[PDB]
């Protein structure tokens, strides 16, 4: 794991909300994060997670999505929207939509469906929501964790679609419908730029298959 001082090197401008101790506590909740594979692989995973976080929150400066005009409610019997609440982006990976706050809360033992603001109020919970997304396979997508740590077996369909192991597939999992394939490559390039910078700081290679312009979104 990166030291306290390295966390400050990687996130020099972050809001004080996002403490190293809160990150470490959240990570203890997901003990395979950053501890799977050889030490270079562990650093690539950490760098990849932090690169997406840095993209989504401008270096852990932001906690909440700026535009709060939209409730991000897709009516659901399984994950019903709470009256008066909104599911706009919160936390390091900008958890969004009732149908993600629901399962995320269930995984963390929290009622995030009815108290979605909690993700922007408790930093351990904030980091746990991001690690939940990173660590959890959600069919048909593997977890970003498994992709980066050599534990994902792409299907034959994945290979034919260009979904090969590396950072690019993580962008695809996170937002490939808009950022990969024929999409405008600007946002994916920003993610890769953070990733390459963080890998350089940690002394490892970014590895192969970084871009996602040559892959289709998952089904």
Residue numbers in the entry: 0 to 218
Paste lines from the article.
After we confirmed that the tree topology did not change based on the presence/absence of loop regions in the MSA, we used the tree based on the unmodified MSA and selected five ancestral nodes where InDels of the loop regions occurred, designated Anc1 to Anc5 based on the presence/absence of loop regions in the extant sequences. To get structural insights into the emergence of antifungal activity in GH19 chitinase, we first solved the X-ray crystal structure of Anc4 and Anc5. Crystal structures of Anc4 and Anc5 solved to 1.13 Å and 1.57 Å, respectively. Overall, the backbone structures of Anc4 and Anc5 were nearly identical (RMSD of Cα = 0.478 Å) and the orientation of catalytic residues is similar, suggesting that loop I and II addition/removal did not cause major structural disruptions. All five ancestral proteins showed a similar level of chitinase activity to the two modern GH19 chitinases, while Anc5 also exhibited antifungal activity. Insertion of loop I to Anc4 resulted in a loss of catalytic activity of Anc4. The loss of the hydrolytic activity in Anc4 via loop I insertion might be due to the lack of disulfide bonding between loop I and the core scaffold. However, it is worth noting that the addition of loop II to Anc4 did not improve its antifungal activity. Anc4 and 5 differ by 45 substitutions, suggesting that loop II enhances antifungal activity in combination with residues in the protein scaffold. By fluorescence microscope experiments, we observed that only Anc5 and Anc5ΔLoop I bound to the surface of fungal hyphae. This result is consistent with the result that Anc5 and Anc5ΔLoop I showed 28-fold stronger antifungal activity than Anc4, suggesting that the acquisition of loop II is necessary to access the substrate in the cell wall of fungi to perform antifungal activity.
